[PDB]
């Protein structure tokens, strides 16, 4: 089953351990409910600590494998309405096509999109089509895997400005416990990510991004250590000296707590330092 | 045992019921651990969601009570240090002497208390002696009870400005499930609130003040619903039009969740509305 990622997760694990087990400047609550019916609710909501603005949202998820049916519908504070229709594994196999839609009963405006996905043996395929304002715009995605090598390309195309607005590529290499990644995006932006699980309980990655049009160079150092079963921490510095710390705990399973700071140097007086609450119920 | 509350504890379970179960404008994180050794430990941690003031804290907390005594050593994030002494029946019975300090490493300042309280029946006593800048201050607070009928007395005396500082009365009376609570401070602000317990699930609460030098009043209601033993939602309103909702869930046994909202009336486009998240973790 050497079925590849698809382009947008390739260099996951190395992203997971930079970005979550932080929350910095947010406090979050994510519950993950369950009806009698089968049909699973999922509450988000987060709110800044400087500008207030408070996010809230409700998800309804109904399922029937025997046709891969998904259907969802989706409620946010802004009152922007969602519906998803998900249908995998029928037109052919594996092929899934999606069918997304928004609106907004205060501004009137609508919003669209057909999503195609075909996983497969050493090649995971995917194209888009976004109906909007400016529409449509064409997205494409390709991946193709073999023995651990990887290698995929990105693109996006405004039909009406009859312009590309994409053109990414991409270089990966996995030998198991560690994972290598490279992408060149519009020709200008290069990037690159080394992810390595050195031992149970310590997992690193390593951050690079350069362009052409300067000497700017960013890069980043992140770990995640595993106490027990139950904790973890994460922390990560970068080249601007931006500290991070992360602390999570399941208090049981199902319930996770996440406290985050993120600390500039050098600073005592004036600094932005910036913190973080998150806590996620599946029940 | 009609061993009376102190004077402090008058018309607790009324204002319990109008401010427990709501945090407007904060984030609270509280939690109480304990150690092998048997010392236990409280950290506690609040945000506002304006003044973007983190306060932090710890407190550790030993026991003896073969000698009737409780060590407390303080810490905060304002690097005050503060030490607690409780030496209760030991001098007498039931008699409590009570050493408290604080002191700030970084601007010298330096305070501390003697605290004495003596609980009988139809008694319930306490004298405190707060030195301070501006010291001693003498507080001192006497309660009588007999038959649901409640009686207290408090004041307070700055000693250097040889001027009474605190002049109240309180008249209550509780018939189980039924508390009713009056009280009269300097002279000038007068105070009235009624717990009731109506049904197994449902609390309720009224809040009544008045002063002379005005005609000005000011009054509220409360209540507590007890969903199922692991949920509870709380609601009140007062005469300004603000109304106040929280909803309390033990995830676990241990562990509880609390999320409120304070709305103003009448507003949309213009008002001061308030959120809160609290959360209390016992280990
Ligand atoms: C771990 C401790 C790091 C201290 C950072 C505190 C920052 C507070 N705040 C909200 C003002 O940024
Ligand atoms: C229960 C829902 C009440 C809505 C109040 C939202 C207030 C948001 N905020 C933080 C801006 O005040």
Same mark, same amino acid.
């Given at each position: ?49 400087? +500008?207030? *603005?408070?996010? =809230?949202?409700?998800? @309804?998820? &109904? %399922? #029937?494998?025997?046709?891969? /049916? ?36 205060? +501004?009137? *405006?609508?919003? =669209?999109?057909?999503? @195609?996905? &075909? %996983? #497969?043996?050493?090649?995971? /395929? ?158």
């Amino acid at each position: 089953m050497a079925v590849p990622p698809a382009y947008a997760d390739l260099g996951k694990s190395a992203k997971d351990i930079f970005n979550k087990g932080y929350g910095f400047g947010m406090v979050k609550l994510d519950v993950k409910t369950k009806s009698a019916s089968g049909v699973e609710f999922k509450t988000s909501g987060s709110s800044n600590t400087d +500008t207030s *603005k408070v996010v =809230g949202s409700l998800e @309804t998820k &109904y %399922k #029937r494998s025997e046709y891969g /049916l998904t259907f969802t519908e989706k409620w946010n504070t802004d009152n922007t309405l969602g519906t998803e229709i998900n249908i995998e594994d029928q037109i052919a196999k594996g092929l899934k096509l999606t069918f997304d839609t928004t609106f907004s009963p205060n +501004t009137g *405006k609508k919003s =669209g999109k057909v999503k @195609t996905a &075909y %996983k #497969r043996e050493f090649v995971n /395929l995917g194209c888009d089509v976004d109906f909007d304002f400016a529409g449509p715009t064409i997205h494409g995605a390709a991946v193709v895997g073999y023995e651990g090598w990887l290698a995929g390309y990105q693109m996006s195309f405004d039909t009406a400005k009859s312009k590309m607005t994409q053109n990414n590529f991409a270089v990966g290499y996995k030998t198991g416990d560690f994972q290598l990644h490279t992408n060149v995006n519009d020709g200008s932006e290069f990037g690159g990510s080394i992810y390595q699980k050195v031992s149970d309980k310590l997992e690193t990655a390593v951050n690079l991004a350069w362009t052409a049009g300067s000497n700017s160079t960013r890069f980043g150092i992140a770990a995640k250590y595993q106490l027990d079963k139950d904790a973890s921490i994460s922390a990560k510095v970068n080249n601007t000296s931006l500290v991070g710390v992360g602390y999570t705990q399941s208090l049981r399973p199902g319930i996770k707590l996440t406290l985050s700071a993120l600390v500039d140097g050098k600073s005592i007086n004036s600094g932005g330092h910036k913190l973080g609450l998150g806590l996620e119920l599946e029940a």
